[PDB]
């Protein structure tokens, strides 16, 4: 029988559009009084209504800004600016594409064994350090890198405590000079200044102590648990590269220096950048290092010389998720571990909407790497650098708002890029522009004449 | 099963002194049992840390103990165109104490030593020293077998062989029934470790004050090695004696080397000439297998059994995860000339970071059923980590996997309750052997009495 357009007041062209998106208005003055003006577009054309006279707005979207997605400014969302135009209660869809272009954030903190045994290895660890910096910078622009050094607990019997001259120069009895002993020095906070990092690494020189096993595990612990000092970022892959050419001290070794207090697993660095608990607290146990590495989400890499690889491979099996690489004149071995670590990094694309009007509601369809339109989903997971996902968003307005022009954003979580969607609400008919102040045909205090009608 | 946990007795030392770090029962000539307590951070008479020893007489109410005096003055001797020097600051007197007959032997493992000759020196290093005391007469002696008068250069010219400069003699100590004092010196021979033996009688008769370098002709030290397995092994971190070759005329030594072979750890059974009779290897790297050793016949066949502690042993758990709990290994001695095989029983801790197996004390026959019993310390065990000591009764099959009784620390956090233990002595004369437990963190010792 009858439709919603004809059977709902429809005193004007504006009320006709307000009823439903399928309604059309006939402005033709040649149309007889019997035929209704507010109807379906099929019904009007069938009733000899002039095709030019029909007012039937169609909702649309216009791509205003459309820069392509980037390769290797950096564009990651496309398009960037869409103009939506909607009639009352109507909706309209549009596409968006998102790509992971920018490189993933990686923190590398580098621990340098600067004991005397490392004199002949010193060049090797400066080379590895500067190669980590330079080559991983080529791998990711979002690298941050920093470093520290260790020797052992500066206490007898590890430390030479005589003659008095030996404290400032532990190489005194060899008629040469080397730096004073120390437990753990934090030297350079994680920074994106690679050129500076490389200069500092090259300035380093060795010290000297008495016993072969060194205190590197104190350094690993403090490098793990001193968040603000080292400067690990929250949303960033953490890598702790540890160098040495010798055995390492372990929990309960400290009793030989009179130290019985177990390692508390807390940060004790502070202002002067030295491990202040070095001489009063025992070395950490494997289980404790494991706990804190896991807790602070840090991957340990042992970069040890060939004579101790088997030792550290064996410790590696006791600290799950740890890997060993060979320190040498060549840096290829260790760099691969880092590249391999970077290879396993995966990201997500989760859309969020900002500044959505009260009147506008949205619905999404996600086309991810599986190439299947998962409906009502606004996030894809498991992306690598270069991968592209796609979404289809539909916007529906509630009736006809008085504001008439608004905007909102669709921005992926953790991306600078976004899509600005400008919205215009088209509620009037074009024939209302041709108002004609004088009634002419009414002449009973009605006023005006538009689209072939009185008040 | 029958140690009374309600009626404890607390003996207390001074703040910060680590009173309770080491302890032993001591029996005077009359037969009256006292408790010797080591307090390796006790302040000397000039407010400088030297350590001390206290001799506690048995009381139910406990309380404060008298200090057993020792000379804490540094010594210098210009002799033979050299300058000998002892340094007692931070020496840790009472880091180990042991009693034999009417003698108490207290050691300062970190007593430093130097020799100067013109512009050269031996290097100021922790040779360690033991002080010997005979309370009922007041006699005092010392034993310091690692002191030398060789200059720094000569060690270098000989590739650091027979280097005893870092011995830390008296790090561990035991005395045989015949009266031979055996010292563990884990810093010996450039941190390989060594043992020093000498009869107590001979230590006393060859000692005079002020000499500093003297001969104890009956003494016997172990050997240096160029075998890398031994490097940094801390052989002599712990020591013990028993019977393991079926020849009652000879005494055997049990030695702990917790970092032996790249932190694999090991315990060795040796003859009195230091010939290896058997070696027991650790199960897991860095577990500190050999931190503790105990000898006692637990299965009633009259053959001494061996107990070893690995307090940082990490247990396997679901989803490939490891949990530091500590382990104790029981080795029962078989008949004939046969070797000690695999463990007859593994006891594993249950609290994370508990360090179960940090101390193992023979208790003698606690319940008097015929089988000897042991206690095993977990200094940071129990649900709140305050410390825990677990009693295991012996049986024909060895020990029970389940403890017969558990003693929870009565002291606050950090006390290290159980870090030291001693048993097998009836302090109150009730016919049952009692247990002394030290909590060095709380500067106290707690006595538990066995009841019917």
């Amino acid at each position: 029988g009858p439709n919603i357009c004809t059977t709902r007041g429809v005193s004007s062209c504006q009320q006709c559009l307000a009823v439903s998106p399928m309604c059309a208005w006939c402005s033709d003055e040649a149309l007889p009084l019997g035929s209704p003006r507010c109807d379906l577009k099929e019904n009007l054309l069938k009733d000899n209504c002039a095709p030019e006279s029909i007012e039937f707005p169609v909702s649309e979207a216009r791509v205003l800004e459309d820069r392509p997605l980037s390769d290797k400014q950096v564009t990651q969302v496309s398009p960037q600016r869409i103009a939506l135009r909607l009639r009352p209660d109507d909706s309209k869809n549009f596409s968006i594409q998102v790509r992971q272009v920018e490189d993933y954030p990686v923190d590398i903190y580098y621990l340098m064994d600067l004991s005397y045994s490392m004199k002949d290895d010193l060049w090797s660890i400066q080379n590895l350090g500067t190669k980590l910096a330079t080559q991983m910078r080529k791998l990711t622009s979002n690298l941050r890198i920093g470093f520290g050094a260790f020797v052992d607990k500066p206490v007898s019997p590890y430390m030479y405590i005589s003659p008095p001259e030996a404290l400032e120069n532990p190489c005194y009895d060899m008629k040469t000079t080397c730096l004073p002993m120390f437990g753990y020095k934090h030297v350079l906070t994680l920074t994106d200044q690679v050129t500076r990092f490389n200069e500092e690494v090259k300035k380093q020189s060795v010290s000297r102590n008495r016993d072969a096993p060194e205190g590197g595990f104190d350094a690993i612990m403090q490098a793990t648990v001193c968040d603000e000092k080292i400067g690990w970022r929250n949303d960033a892959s953490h890598l702790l590269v540890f160098t040495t050419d010798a055995k390492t001290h372990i929990a309960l070794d400290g009793r030989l220096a009179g130290i019985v207090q177990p390692n508390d697993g807390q940060c004790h660095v502070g202002s002067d950048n030295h491990y202040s608990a070095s001489t009063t607290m025992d070395y950490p146990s494997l289980g404790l290092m494991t706990e804190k590495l896991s807790q602070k989400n840090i991957n340990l890499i042992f970069a040890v010389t060939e004579n101790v690889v088997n030792l550290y491979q064996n410790y590696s099996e006791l600290i799950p998720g740890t890997t060993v690489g060979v320190l040498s004149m060549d840096s290829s071995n260790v760099l691969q571990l880092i590249v391999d670590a970077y290879g396993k990094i995966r990201s997500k694309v989760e859309l969020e909407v900002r500044d959505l009007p009260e009147e506008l509601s949205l619905s999404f369809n996600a086309t991810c790497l599986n190439n299947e339109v998962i409906p009502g989903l606004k996030s894809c997971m498991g992306l690598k650098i270069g991968d592209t996902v796609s979404f289809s968003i539909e916007a529906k307005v509630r009736g006809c708002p008085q504001e008439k022009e608004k905007s909102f954003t669709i921005k992926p979580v953790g991306f600078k890029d976004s899509l600005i969607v400008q919205v215009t609400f088209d509620c009037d008919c074009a024939c209302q522009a041709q108002a004609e102040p004088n009634s002419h045909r009414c002449n009973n205090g009605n006023g005006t004449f538009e689209c072939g009608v009185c008040r | 099963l029958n140690l009374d946990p309600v009626q404890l007795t607390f003996y207390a030392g001074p703040n910060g002194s680590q009173f309770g770090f080491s302890l032993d029962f001591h029996k005077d000539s009359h037969g009256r049992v006292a408790i010797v307590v080591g307090a390796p951070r006790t302040l000397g008479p000039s407010q400088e840390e030297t350590g001390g020893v206290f001799l506690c007489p048995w009381r139910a109410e406990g309380g404060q103990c008298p200090s057993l005096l020792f000379d804490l003055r540094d010594e210098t001797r210009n002799v033979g165109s050299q300058t000998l020097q002892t340094f007692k600051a931070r020496q840790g007197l009472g880091a180990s104490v042991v009693s034999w007959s009417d003698v108490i032997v207290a050691c300062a493992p970190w007593q430093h030593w130097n020799v100067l000759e013109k512009t050269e020196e031996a290097e100021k290093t922790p040779v360690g020293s033991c002080f010997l005391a005979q309370p009922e007469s007041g006699r005092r002696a010392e034993y310091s077998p690692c002191r030398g008068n060789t200059l720094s250069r000569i060690y270098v010219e000989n590739d650091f062989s027979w280097d005893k400069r870092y011995c830390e003699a008296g790090f561990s100590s035991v005395v045989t029934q015949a009266g031979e004092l055996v010292l563990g010196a884990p810093g010996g021979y450039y941190f390989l470790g060594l043992l020093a033996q000498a009869p107590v009688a001979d230590i006393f008769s060859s000692y005079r004050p002020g000499i500093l370098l003297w001969h104890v002709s009956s003494q016997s030290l172990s050997f240096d090695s160029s075998n890398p397995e031994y490097f940094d092994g801390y052989w002599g971190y712990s020591v013990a004696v028993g019977e393991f070759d079926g020849d009652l005329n000879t005494t055997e030594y049990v030695v702990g080397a917790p970092t032996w072979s790249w932190t694999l750890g090991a315990v060795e059974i040796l003859d009195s000439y230091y010939q290896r009779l058997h070696r027991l290897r650790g199960e897991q790297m860095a577990s500190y297998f050999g931190h503790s050793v105990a000898v006692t016949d637990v299965n009633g066949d009259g053959r001494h059994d061996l107990l070893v502690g690995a307090p940082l042993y990490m247990e396997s758990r679901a989803d490939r995860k490891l949990a530091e709990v500590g382990r104790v290994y029981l080795f029962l001695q078989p008949r004939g000339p046969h070797a000690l095989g695999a463990p007859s029983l593994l006891l594993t801790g249950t609290q994370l970071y508990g360090r179960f197996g940090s101390a193992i004390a023979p208790l003698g026959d606690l319940d008097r059923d015929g089988y000897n019993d042991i206690a095993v310390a977990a200094p940071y065990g129990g649900p709140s980590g305050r410390g825990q000591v677990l009693v295991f009764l012996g049986q024909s099959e060895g020990l029970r996997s389940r403890p017969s009784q558990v003693l929870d620390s009565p002291f606050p956090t950090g006390s290290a309750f159980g870090f030291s233990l001693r048993g097998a002595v009836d302090i109150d004369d009730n016919g049952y052997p009692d247990l002394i437990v030290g909590a060095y963190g709380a500067n106290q010792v707690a006595v538990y009495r066995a009841q019917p």
Binding site: S115, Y116, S117, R208, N209, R210, D211, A212, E214, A246 | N158, D159, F160, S161, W162, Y190, F191, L192, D224, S225, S226, F231, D232
Partner: peptide
């Protein structure tokens, strides 16, 4: 006896 077991 002979060894290089220090920090060398």
């Amino acid at each position: 006896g002979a060894k290089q077991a220090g920090d060398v």
